[PDB]
Design a protein around this nucleic acid. Structure first.
Ligand SMILES: [Mg+2]
Ligand SMILES: [Mg+2]
Ligand SMILES: [Mg+2]
Ligand SMILES: [Mg+2]
Ligand SMILES: [Mg+2]
Ligand SMILES: [Mg+2]
Ligand SMILES: [Mg+2]
Ligand SMILES: [Mg+2]
Ligand SMILES: [Mg+2]
Ligand SMILES: [Mg+2]
Ligand SMILES: [Mg+2]
Ligand SMILES: [Mg+2]
Ligand SMILES: [Mg+2]
Ligand SMILES: [Mg+2]
Ligand SMILES: [Mg+2]
Ligand SMILES: [Mg+2]
Ligand SMILES: [Mg+2]
Ligand SMILES: [Mg+2]
Ligand SMILES: [Mg+2]
Ligand SMILES: [Mg+2]
Ligand SMILES: [Mg+2]
Ligand SMILES: [Mg+2]
Ligand SMILES: [Mg+2]
Ligand SMILES: [Mg+2]
Ligand SMILES: [Mg+2]
Ligand SMILES: [Mg+2]
Ligand SMILES: [Mg+2]
Ligand SMILES: [Mg+2]
Ligand SMILES: [Mg+2]
Ligand SMILES: [Mg+2]
Ligand SMILES: [Mg+2]
Ligand SMILES: [Mg+2]
Ligand SMILES: [Mg+2]
Ligand SMILES: [Mg+2]
Ligand SMILES: [Mg+2]
Ligand SMILES: [Mg+2]
Ligand SMILES: [Mg+2]
Ligand SMILES: [Mg+2]
Ligand SMILES: [Mg+2]
Ligand SMILES: [Mg+2]
Ligand SMILES: [Mg+2]
Ligand SMILES: [Mg+2]
Ligand SMILES: [Mg+2]
Ligand SMILES: [Mg+2]
Ligand SMILES: [Mg+2]
Ligand SMILES: [Mg+2]
Ligand SMILES: [Mg+2]
Ligand SMILES: [Mg+2]
Ligand SMILES: [Zn+2]
Lengths: 53, 134, 122, 27, 50, 86, 52
RNA sequence: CGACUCUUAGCGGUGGAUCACUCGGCUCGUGCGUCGAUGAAGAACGCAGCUAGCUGCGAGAAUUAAUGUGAAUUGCAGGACACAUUGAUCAUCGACACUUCGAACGCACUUGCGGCCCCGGGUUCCUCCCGGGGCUACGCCUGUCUGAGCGUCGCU
RNA sequence: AGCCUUGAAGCCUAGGGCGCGGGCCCGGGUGGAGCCGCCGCAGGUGCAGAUCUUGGUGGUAGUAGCAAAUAUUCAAACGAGAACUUUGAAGGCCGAAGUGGAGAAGGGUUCCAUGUGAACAGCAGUUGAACAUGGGUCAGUCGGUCCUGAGAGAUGGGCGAGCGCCGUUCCGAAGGGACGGGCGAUGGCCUCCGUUGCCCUCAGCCGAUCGAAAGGGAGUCGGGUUCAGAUCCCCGAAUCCG
RNA sequence: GGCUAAAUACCGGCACGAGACCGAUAGUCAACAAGUACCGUAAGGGAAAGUUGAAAAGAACUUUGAAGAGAGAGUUCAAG
RNA sequence: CGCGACCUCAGAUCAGACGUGGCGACCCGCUGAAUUUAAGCAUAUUAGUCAGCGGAGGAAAAGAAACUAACCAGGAUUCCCUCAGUAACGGCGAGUGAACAGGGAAGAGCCCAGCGCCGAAUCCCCGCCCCGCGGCGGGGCGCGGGAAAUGUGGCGUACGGA
């Protein structure tokens, strides 16, 4: 799917918070909040060079 | 080989339609071959199994020549319960062991008007095919 | 002693109402039994008397609607619920007569120049 | 004849916080 | 509050009734997977928002 | 005192439940729903939130009447007939 | 409402009602406190209904 | 001596990798291509003998009728004088039914106030009270009725 | 005419080996159902790092700590079990701007009875606002309900591509009412009165509607009663409105 | 001023078929009571979570303990 | 003054109808950026694209030349191939960029106003009779009502027509 990995509003915390600069899931109150997103090294992200039809 | 474009041979689809089959379809899936004597008498090969039928277990731990009455057709679990095909629990109470209908042979049929109608229809469609080949 | 719809079909409206009343009284007693220690047999009867109530009401409602349709059959204007449902867009279509209409100009053209059946030699 | 299970849900915490309790400034 | 609207008291009453453990005969059902009511709510641990 | 101390003063609800969409997004002072836009006749819907459109689109609910239409369509929306009686 | 409750009780059990008090319970049900006229004994009536 | 420490190995833990499974996805292709004031989509609250959720249904409420099917459903109980042209169950679905809000429609949105017509019970013709039923929204087309104008006139 | 329930993959192994190496073979164990060689094809194909992602686990470490608001002690009971529960007795504290007795907002069953002592209540618990099983909120008179407030908001109108917006008396034929009178029609305790239709007569309100559980706004008090409700239940005595 | 089928389009819907695709940190967020639980006043944000066994045969009974837990015993090809 | 026509305009819980909201992959009409590229940046590009608003249908839109051409001519619309990264546009930079012809898929053509002739020859609704009646229509009969000469119907429309 062309949406896989992208159906989130993740945003990078930026430097200074002692974490890598990968974009992170917003909000709180669930396991998903503050996790990595989008990048191909992330669980639940988008794969590298998604295959095309 | 299958050629019908509207019949799926997909494994996932065929298992899903087996395990979600409605009650009146599980009845047809729960069919047993007839004995050699019954098969000759009626010209039918298989019948859907029914309560009060008398069967022989031909596979598993309980196989043998003993004929027992069908006491319960548990279509939800896809098994039948047969007289004397049972074991004991830890507390000593006896519990029926489920046998799949495809692993028994019907020696005597529970006959009523509807069953005689179903046997007749099966035997007639068979003869139409035999004359078609002949 | 069970209630079947086939039994109730010919019964008059008054009998069904009386038959309905007996069931409703019986259900009320059962709901009292449900809370005052009734037997499992009485609890199981609750569902049977409920569906019996539904059967009688179903036959009363059906008997009434058939007569209403006979009453309004030849009438120009009918209650909205006796008019065909179909879908909203289908109810707004040009009806059968309106779609078949043609201008006299179109009728004359089709009379004078009908499409012919022909073949061309190979 | 089983009556053992139990459970109770609650909010999942989140640790998106920043202390920042100092400054030099020491230009 | 004691001062309540009928609509609020009706919403609260439904939340009261959902807040029970599952019947224990659900466990013996043929294809059952549910072990407990995973939607239990505690008036102090998590709030209704209304 | 903008943190912990100020959080103790909040005891006045801004929103309540909405009679149309049933979400606690009905602004009481503005008499408007933040979610569905009630009392506007048309439903509030935007294309910058695809996730929000799939949370309340047709299909997510009960389909009380639409799914009977899907069944009736397969027989041409026939009416006023019954199967031939036994 | 109370008027409807009163008329239903009279017709269902052929008794007479002095007054009716109602509340809606925390579980959403409505409870009716129906008082019978002084010439009817609730204990006797409860026996007919099957309460006691 | 013996602790402690380190290395290796057996066994035991902690942990849930791996592997095998897949009633799920994803992609492509085909046919059809159908919502609503006859009240949609959506939302709320209810409904099971034991039932919280999911699922289904709407006070006829885990469903009625009909048709096909042909002996079950099932976790437990029960069997209505449920059970074979006195039809279990499932399926189909054309009959009937379908609470509250919602374009949402008497006015408001608190389960607040009405108005008109008819019906039933109190009473005792009207009134009055209670209950039931039917109506009472905006725009707009055709026509109908009732009107308006120091608009144009005709006869008086 | 590969392997495999006479045991596949996977995993483990101070077993025997091969290869410069990437790796691979065999032995033994566990495992329980599939797998591999060779010629070709294809690729989401090889990790030590990226303050990499997600999950798990360490040392630190039985360590920091469990020190704000003066304080506990004796006996007995239940109980397997008591510094912490209950009863009794002491010694203390809050000291009527209370650590007392009642409400508003908010909560939403936390309330009450009984039971449990798994998890939770940063020691424990025989206890709890935990868990489980059942109960509990009664009104003409107490509030809402009605009024208008600051304000909000339709219609007419205006503007606007348009969803719509402005505006609240402003570019409006904005009254569906009435004492009475005259013409009829229907009924009934048919005497004569109602109701009802039309006409005459009369008519400022001038702004739909919403807006307060602290403002305006008629009228309920005494006693008793429950495990939990009472100006609501029962007893008695009243009162407003229609 | 006006009407007009066909060949064309179709990541929504109803119903189907297939694949050199992925195989539970993958593939849809969602293989499961998932747009759920949970967070936010709100607009919104949004997971984790698959596998006993062929068959429940899911361990009767004895014994220590207040119990959790144990020791025996038993089911199963296997509870290694 | 009264009565009566017409015109313009009102009120009706008047008789019978119709619109509203949703979904929105594809379609039509608007409105409409900025990240971005130009190694800066303002024109330009991004892009008539995202976002925003309206309206549909099973398809939509378009469509039977006020066309292309300049040939020995073709002949509605839509789509595919090619024309063609071409003619052209462009701080003539970065970049952008069609058409005709040709080969195919499909193939379908028509109707008014006007100018005229026909005694309005036309239409809607109500009431009764026959037929049908879950797509509300066919025929007959009303000195029944209205619309319509401020123009309905038939013939006829550029390929000419009467
Ligand atoms: Mg992924
Ligand atoms: Mg013509
Ligand atoms: Mg709190
Ligand atoms: Mg505010
Ligand atoms: Mg329930
Ligand atoms: Mg039925
Ligand atoms: Mg049947
Ligand atoms: Mg109010
Ligand atoms: Mg080793
Ligand atoms: Mg296996
Ligand atoms: Mg791959
Ligand atoms: Mg790796
Ligand atoms: Mg690594
Ligand atoms: Mg220490
Ligand atoms: Mg206090
Ligand atoms: Mg107190
Ligand atoms: Mg503790
Ligand atoms: Mg308490
Ligand atoms: Mg406004
Ligand atoms: Mg008010
Ligand atoms: Mg007030
Ligand atoms: Mg009193
Ligand atoms: Mg067109
Ligand atoms: Mg997983
Ligand atoms: Mg996943
Ligand atoms: Mg994992
Ligand atoms: Mg894996
Ligand atoms: Mg997961
Ligand atoms: Mg695993
Ligand atoms: Mg083993
Ligand atoms: Mg009307
Ligand atoms: Mg630049
Ligand atoms: Mg640059
Ligand atoms: Mg720049
Ligand atoms: Mg520019
Ligand atoms: Mg441009
Ligand atoms: Mg857009
Ligand atoms: Mg729109
Ligand atoms: Mg629309
Ligand atoms: Mg459509
Ligand atoms: Mg054109
Ligand atoms: Mg063309
Ligand atoms: Mg070229
Ligand atoms: Mg451009
Ligand atoms: Mg061309
Ligand atoms: Mg062709
Ligand atoms: Mg003309
Ligand atoms: Mg032309
Ligand atoms: Zn809303």
């Amino acid at each position: 799917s062309e949406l896989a990995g992208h159906q989130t509003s993740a945003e990078s915390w930026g430097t200074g918070r002692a974490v890598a600069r990968i974009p992170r899931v917003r909000g709180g109150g669930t396991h998903r909040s503050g996790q990595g997103a989008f990048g191909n090294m992330c669980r639940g992200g988008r794969m590298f060079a998604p295959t095309k039809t | 080989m299958k050629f019908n474009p509207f019949v799926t041979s997909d494994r996932s689809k065929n298992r899903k339609r087996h395990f979600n089959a409605p009650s009146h379809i599980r009845r047809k899936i729960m069919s047993s071959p007839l004995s050699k004597e019954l098969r000759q008498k009626y010209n039918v090969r298989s019948m859907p199994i029914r309560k009060d039928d008398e069967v022989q277990v031909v596979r598993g731990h309980y196989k043998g020549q003993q004929i027992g009455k069908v006491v319960q057709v548990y279509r939800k679990k896809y098994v039948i319960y047969i007289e004397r095909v049972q074991r004991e629990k830890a507390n000593g109470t006896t519990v029926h062991v489920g046998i799949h209908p495809s692993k028994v042979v019907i020696t005597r049929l529970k006959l009523d008007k509807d069953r005689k109608k179903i046997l007749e229809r099966k035997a007639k469609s068979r003869q139409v095919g035999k004359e078609k080949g002949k | 002693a069970k209630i079947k719809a086939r039994d109730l079909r010919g019964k008059k409206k008054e009998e069904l109402l009386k038959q309905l009343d007996d069931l409703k009284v019986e259900l009320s007693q059962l709901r009292v039994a449900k809370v005052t220690g009734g037997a499992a047999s009485k609890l199981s009867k609750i569902r049977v008397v409920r569906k019996s109530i539904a059967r009688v009401l179903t036959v009363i409602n059906q008997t009434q609607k058939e007569n209403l349709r006979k009453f309004y059959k030849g009438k120009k204007y009918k209650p909205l619920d006796l008019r065909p449902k179909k879908t909203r867009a289908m109810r707004r279509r040009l009806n059968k007569h309106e779609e078949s209409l043609k201008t006299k100009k179109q009728q004359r053209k089709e009379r004078l120049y009908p499409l012919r059946k022909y073949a061309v030699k190979a | 004849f089983v009556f053992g299970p139990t459970g109770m849900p609650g909010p999942t915490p989140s640790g998106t916080n920043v202390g920042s309790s100092g400054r030099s400034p020491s230009v | 509050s004691s001062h309540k609207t009928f609509r609020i008291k009706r919403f609260l009453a439904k939340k009261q009734k959902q807040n029970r453990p599952i019947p224990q005969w659900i466990w013996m059902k043929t294809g059952n997977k549910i072990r407990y009511n995973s939607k239990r709510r505690h008036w102090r641990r998590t709030k209704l928002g209304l | 005192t903008k943190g912990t101390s100020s959080f103790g003063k909040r005891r006045n609800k801004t929103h309540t439940l909405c009679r149309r969409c049933g979400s606690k997004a009905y602004h009481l002072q503005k008499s408007t729903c933040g979610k569905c836009g009630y009392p506007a006749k048309r439903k509030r819907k935007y294309n910058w939130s695809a996730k929000a459109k799939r949370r309340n689109t047709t299909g997510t609910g009960r389909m009380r009447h639409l799914k009977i239409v899907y069944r009736r369509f397969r027989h041409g929306f026939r009416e006023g007939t019954t199967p031939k009686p036994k | 409402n109370k008027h409807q409750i009163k008329q239903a009780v009279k017709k269902l059990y052929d008794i007479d009602v002095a007054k009716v008090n109602t509340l809606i319970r925390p579980d959403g049900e409505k409870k009716a406190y129906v008082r019978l006229a002084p010439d009817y004994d609730a204990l006797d009536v409860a026996n007919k209904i099957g309460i006691i």
